Design a protein around this ligand. Sequence first.
Ligand SMILES: CCNC(=O)N1N=C(c2cc(F)ccc2F)C[C@@]1(CCCN)c1ccccc1
Ligand SMILES: Nc1ncnc2c1ncn2[C@@H]1O[C@H](COP(=O)(O)OP(=O)(O)O)[C@@H](O)[C@H]1O
Ligand SMILES: [Mg+2]
Length: 330
Amino acid sequence: NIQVVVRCRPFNLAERKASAHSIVECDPVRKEVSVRTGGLADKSSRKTYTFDMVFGASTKQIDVYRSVVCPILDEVIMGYNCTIFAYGQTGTGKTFTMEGERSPNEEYTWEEDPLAGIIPRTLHQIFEKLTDNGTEFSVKVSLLEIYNEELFDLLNPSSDVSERLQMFDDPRNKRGVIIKGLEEITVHNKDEVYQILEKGAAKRTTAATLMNAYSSRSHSVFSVTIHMKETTIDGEELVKIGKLNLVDLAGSENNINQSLLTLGRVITALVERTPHVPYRESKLTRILQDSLGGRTRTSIIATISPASLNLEETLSTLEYAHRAKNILNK
Ligand SMILES: CCNC(=O)N1N=C(c2cc(F)ccc2F)C[C@@]1(CCCN)c1ccccc1
Ligand SMILES: Nc1ncnc2c1ncn2[C@@H]1O[C@H](COP(=O)(O)OP(=O)(O)O)[C@@H](O)[C@H]1O
Ligand SMILES: [Mg+2]
């Protein structure tokens, strides 16, 4: 039930120059990804995997949005909860996919940059989906990050990222938690979302200088909650609450990452139908408990490299993402 897609990144400027041969081949039609596990493109062994969707190195950012995000967002607009994870070795594109980048030399505005990833596009489409239908709505965003099992808020400008938040169990609704001090910024208009990301980025830098390899070892959960009141052409004002969680996971490459380690154990228990699922063993799995075997619609975009020097990691990632397909939750 949990949908899993694979995204291979293209070779960089230094790989094309070193005349690199891709050990990875994608077949979107057959939704399969094939990787050469032994030398020689003249003769060799291969390992194949089938996923709900596969996107080759030529896949553009807009292709990921129209294909995976747009549908998920729709479901969020209907009043449901959805989560999208990005799993993969450092350098394969987790952040590129989830956040994206800016085209060089200020060639475009943020809302039109073809390099923009899921988060900016989503925030911009929410304001162009509901506004363009006259519905009373309200968007809230939060950016909770995890590093060495400590929680950080990368968006409230009052305190710095050296302030560790506390987590407790939410006695109201089961399988949930309360983060004391977590900030929920309100996004009033499109012209306000970039500003928010700008701030987050500035704090991301601070966390990086304060914590070792922060960008590779941390887990980030960017949440967007939409409070809606759709007044159709009739007059019925329906009450809808939708939450979308965009999770940029720590690099899967393998000191110890308790949340990553626990996320793996949790998937294992869910797919092997074991009675006890270790959700409580990490901040990530407790925070996102409802996204693993709960009532939330979840999708995992596993990122991979086409370079042969990343073979071992590429297989581990695919093997992992492949096992994840058997998780049933809704
Ligand atoms: C520096 C100014 N900010 C900035 O460019 N951006 N800041 C980003 C960003 C910052 C966060 F805290 C959390 C989630 C995010 F999405 C996304 C990014 C790219 C960020 C780097 N991967 C962007 C915005 C709009 C269009 C294309 C890219
Ligand atoms: N799909 C892609 N298309 C073009 N470049 C990509 C793609 N994915 C990743 N890259 C590039 O690969 C490098 C790794 O980026 P990044 O997303 O930060 O990795 P990660 O988040 O997995 O650690 C960057 O220079 C980025 O620009
Ligand atoms: Mg990264």
